[PDB]
Design a protein around this ligand. Structure first.
Ligand SMILES: *[C@@H]1O[C@H](CO)[C@@H](O)[C@H](O)[C@H]1NC(C)=O
Ligand SMILES: *[C@@H]1O[C@H](CO)[C@@H](O)[C@H](O)[C@H]1NC(C)=O
Ligand SMILES: *[C@@H]1O[C@H](CO)[C@@H](O)[C@H](O)[C@H]1NC(C)=O
Ligand SMILES: *[C@@H]1O[C@H](CO)[C@@H](O)[C@H](O)[C@H]1NC(C)=O
Lengths: 386, 540
């Protein structure tokens, strides 16, 4: 075990009423020396008093906001202690009114700006301030001072003769946070309100924005259908039958490629393909032409009257049927079937039949799509003797 | 015979009211329909939730309370339409008695098949304004469509953002997202079509419509949009310093603490009227309370999102009026309706101070602007000097962001239509020498001349205004119905499709015509030449 050793003692600051004041206290040793902030003030608060511990356990940053005179103005000490030793260092805060601010005091010319940056491109947070004497530039990331002493890292301190700012070469999710700059000289310290920084940018594989929707119309009926694909960079949108490309490829569009269906005849699975340097996607369209119903089931003679015959039949179709057409005629006659139209049930009695004559009955399934094939026929046996 | 309409949250009783014009049929209206839970107490500063259900027949006969706002408090007058500011006393009749429980909307049904739905979002400023002041009954019966005017959380309650989990912000836009979700699942009972929904806004509300098309959440809600004198690219469209003005308000109510969580919970303890009565003056020509980039609703920069193709799905119609920046020079104008050379150079210098914030080499741009907007055919004309000076504020604040939006939408053959309004009504609201100002296209879209002069529009219309308004209403309904302003009802003139190469727009006026490259000489100035003189980043 090693007793605690101060690595960064706090310096006395002088903030403005209604502003912020941030003290820094860090130490090292074995074990990790915990830091307790003991303000020796006649009037103590808790809502402004917030201690922000370092993410690596080195030290803590006391923060008071907003500064209100003369209650926040007191003496603050940093007690770093462990089970081996105990040390303390005190620092003084100075809070003054709005008028006590003299000439040449740190004044924020341009505060931090909201900005979004690319993952690998350069991120630049700008901050301008002027004072007499020339104030020093320091940045705060999430109530914590920004460490830019190392030049080998991605974070760099831009310092031009006019104004200095903050620059980030390669961005990560860690950079996403609140940033606030503040100028500090021998006169005092005046903050500027923070500015949030977001780090999420455009290089996303293409996604289908308007996917192709399947439809059904009577064959022949042309229709203009839409497929839209988006993303950065914008991908080429190509319509594909599954074997050959419908688009000329040479001048294929980008972003949107509406397909014209001419002389609609047979159903087919169409495929809208959107490809980019990042990825390739596919979407299928169930273009189905409205098909005719299959022939109904074989009817059966239920009631056998001399002059009438009752029939019941199966639909034979999984899809609904509008009506049924009964086709009656003599047995071996080559005459076109005399048709009974408008039968809305699966059972119908054919009236008007001449007795003792074998007949042939066929049921026809017809929907909105058209007249389907005729069902299988049947025969009955009625006989009279003279 | 009161009309009854069933919803997913209970039955509503409305009223069949006939329009004063004999040619237009009667319409059914249902006012004060709750589309979300009351954003009070704990629901304050939170995303909207579905509204509670009611068992019986809920009365939809009276007006609902408006959101907390105050017009007497100092607000940026330049953002408001002039018909709003010219009649502040008449507007006060709609703002009286505000309540934090203000999430209600209004529907209009004209009385074959499903009827198209149009959703309106009015925006005087991001702090005031409501849809109750606009009656879309004429547009409903004339176009046989459904007009919807709503209310949403405005001011501090709808846009407070601390940039973290304590207050993400953008609560106002989320209310408009929730409304469209409820309308999409409950308009089929009104005989409306959820697949033919067209959201349209004007002024600041048009800036809101632009943001909704870029949102990830509006995907399956609407299919078309109409933007009128608004953009998501203006300086007041998005607040790029929300934490600063929010903490200044917290110091005014005393709730300013260090933890953003402890202060948000503190603000909900305060009354909703104490927050509105407080006056906060932001940077000039900027907004103090408005939409923010939260990484969810607005994930990136608006222009950045437009290059991604986020809003290419929806059919877009947009356009601007002739002289939008009337209030910019109105104070400088002398009694002779002229601007002097010293007053011209002074007003130009004020322009460079506010928007661009003292860059190095700023003196280079003051004289460049003065050269651009100076008719060398008539250098000493005070009235022409006033004319070009209004065109200055009009080009940079409305015309420049609108053309950039239209090019980024029509870039990949998506249906886009552009207009230019060159007609305004005649009254004492605005000086006679001024042309179509901010919000002057609103009456012609809703067919106000069809009814006559109103308490809010004391204009003295002519027969040419009714003919023009019927033309405008036909273009709007045709676009909301089919995505094409020319189909299916023709004019008794063809509006061509916009593309970045031809740049075809429709000159709307008493002489309707089609021209090209609207003010394109000044457009490339602000988009290409101006930023290069602002890119003094060579020091880096
Ligand atoms: C093709 O699409 C265009 C889109 O403007 C439409 O006008 C046309 O009617 C469509 N053609 C067919 C055959 O549907
Ligand atoms: C489409 O694909 C599915 C499965 O891949 C297949 O069952 C169906 O028959 C196809 N349709 C056509 C018209 O080829
Ligand atoms: C609705 O209002 C009518 C009168 O306008 C009244 O008779 C009725 O009781 C009311 N119903 C409810 C549920 O408030
Ligand atoms: C009011 O209408 C009359 C038409 O009778 C018109 O002459 C007058 O100019 C209108 N008022 C204004 C302020 O324009």
């Amino acid at each position: 075990e090693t007793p605690p050793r101060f690595t960064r003692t706090p310096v006395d600051q002088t903030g403005v009423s209604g502003g912020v004041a941030s003290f820094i206290c860090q130490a090292t040793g074995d074990p990790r020396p915990k830091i307790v902030w003991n303000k020796k003030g006649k009037k103590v608060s808790n809502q402004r008093f917030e201690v922000i511990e370092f993410d690596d356990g080195s030290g803590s940053v006391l923060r008071i906001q907003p500064l209100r005179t003369p209650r926040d103005e007191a003496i603050y000490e940093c007690v770093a202690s462990n089970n081996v030793g105990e040390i303390s260092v005190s620092t003084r805060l100075t809070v003054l009114r709005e008028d006590q601010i003299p000439r040449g005091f740190p004044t924020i010319d341009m505060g931090p700006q909201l900005k979004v940056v690319e993952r690998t491109r350069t991120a630049t947070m700008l901050c301008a301030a002027s004072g007499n004497p020339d104030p020093e530039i320091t940045w705060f990331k999430d109530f914590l001072p920004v460490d830019t002493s190392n030049n080998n890292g991605r974070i760099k301190q831009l310092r031009s003769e006019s104004i200095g700012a903050l620059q980030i070469e390669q961005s990560e999710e860690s950079d996403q946070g609140k940033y606030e700059c503040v100028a500090t000289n021998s006169a005092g310290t005046r903050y500027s309100a923070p500015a949030n920084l977001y780090v999420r940018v455009r290089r996303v594989p293409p996604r289908f924005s308007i996917p192709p929707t399947n439809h059904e119309i009577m064959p022949g009926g042309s229709v203009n259908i839409t497929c839209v694909a988006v993303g950065s960079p914008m991908p080429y949108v190509k319509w594909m039958l599954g074997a050959e490309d419908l688009t000329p490829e040479d001048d294929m569009p980008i972003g949107r490629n509406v397909l014209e269906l001419n002389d609609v005849r047979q159903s087919a699975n169409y495929t809208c393909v959107a490809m980019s340097t990042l990825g390739v996607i596919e979407a299928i369209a169930q273009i189905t032409v409205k098909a005719l119903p299959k022939p109904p089931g074989t009817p059966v003679v239920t009631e056998s009257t001399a002059t009438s015959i009752t029939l019941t039949w199966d639909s034979g179709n999984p899809e609904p049927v509008s009506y049924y057409i009964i086709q009656h005629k003599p047995k071996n006659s080559e005459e076109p079937y005399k048709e009974i139209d408008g039968i809305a049930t699966t059972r119908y009695s054919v009236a008007g039949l001449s007795p003792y004559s074998d007949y042939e009955f066929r049921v026809v399934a017809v929907n909105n799509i058209g007249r389907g094939p005729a069902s299988e026929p049947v025969l009955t046996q009625k006989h009279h003797h003279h | 015979p009161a009309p009854t309409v069933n919803t997913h949250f209970g039955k509503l009783r409305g009223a069949r009211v006939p329009l004063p014009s004999e040619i237009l049929g009667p319409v059914d209206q249902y006012l004060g329909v709750p589309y979300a839970a009351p954003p009070i107490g704990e629901k304050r500063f939170l995303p909207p939730e579905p509204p509670p259900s009611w068992s019986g027949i809920r009365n939809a006969t009276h007006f609902p309370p408006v959101c907390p706002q105050n017009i007497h408090t100092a607000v940026p007058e330049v953002m408001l339409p002039v018909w709003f500011t010219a009649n502040l006393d008449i507007v006060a009749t709609y703002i009286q008695e505000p309540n934090e429980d203000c999430l209600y909307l209004n529907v209009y049904v004209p009385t074959s098949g499903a009827k198209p739905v149009m959703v309106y979002i009015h925006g005087g400023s991001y702090m005031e304004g409501t849809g109750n002041m606009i009656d879309g009954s004429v547009l409903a019966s004339y176009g046989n469509v459904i007009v919807i005017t709503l209310n949403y959380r405005v001011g501090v309650l709808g846009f407070l953002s601390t940039g973290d989990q304590a207050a993400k912000g953008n609560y106002g836009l989320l209310d408009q997202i929730q409304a469209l979700r409820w309308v999409s699942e409950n308009i089929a009972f009104f005989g409306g079509d959820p697949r033919r929904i067209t959201v349209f806004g004007s002024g600041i509300g048009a800036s809101c419509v632009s943001l909704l098309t870029l949102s990830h959440h509006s995907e399956g809600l609407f299919q078309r949009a109409i933007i009128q004198s608004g953009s998501a690219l203006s300086s007041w469209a998005v607040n790029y310093q929300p934490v600063k003005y929010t903490s200044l308000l917290a110091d005014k109510v005393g709730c300013n603490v260090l933890d953003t969580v402890d202060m948000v919970d503190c603000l909900r303890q305060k009354s909703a009227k104490e927050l509105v009565e407080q006056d906060i003056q932001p940077a000039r020509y900027h907004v103090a309370f408005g939409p923010v980039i939260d990484g969810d609703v607005i994930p990136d920069d608006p222009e950045i999102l437009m290059e991604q193709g986020e809003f290419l799905n929806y059919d877009i119609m947009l356009g601007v009026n002739q002289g939008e920046g009337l209030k910019f020079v109105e104070g400088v104008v002398d009694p002779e309706d002229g601007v002097s050379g010293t007053d011209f150079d002074y007003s130009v210098s004020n322009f460079v101070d506010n928007l661009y914030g003292y860059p190095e080499g700023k003196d280079t741009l003051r004289e460049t602007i003065k050269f651009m907007y100076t008719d060398w055919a008539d250098r000493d004309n005070p009235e022409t000097r006033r004319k070009t000076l209004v065109a200055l504020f009009t080009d940079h604040q409305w015309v420049e962001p609108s053309v950039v939006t239209a090019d980024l939408h029509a870039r990949y053959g998506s249906p886009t239509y552009f207009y230019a309004f060159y007609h305004h009504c005649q009254s004492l609201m605005k000086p006679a020498w001024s042309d179509a100002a901010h919000g002057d296209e609103v009456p012609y879209v809703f067919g106000v001349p069809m009814v006559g002069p109103t308490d809010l529009f004391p204009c003295n219309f002519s027969k040419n205004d009714v003919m023009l308004s019927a033309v405008v209403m036909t273009y709007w309904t045709n676009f909301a119905k089919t995505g094409d302003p020319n189909k299916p009802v023709p004019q008794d003139v063809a509006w061509s499709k916009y593309n970045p190469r031809d740049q075809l727009y429709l000159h709307i006026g008493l002489k309707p015509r089609v021209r090209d490259h609207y003010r394109a000489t000044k457009v490339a100035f602000w988009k290409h030449l101006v930023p290069h003189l602002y890119n003094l980043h060579d020091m880096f």
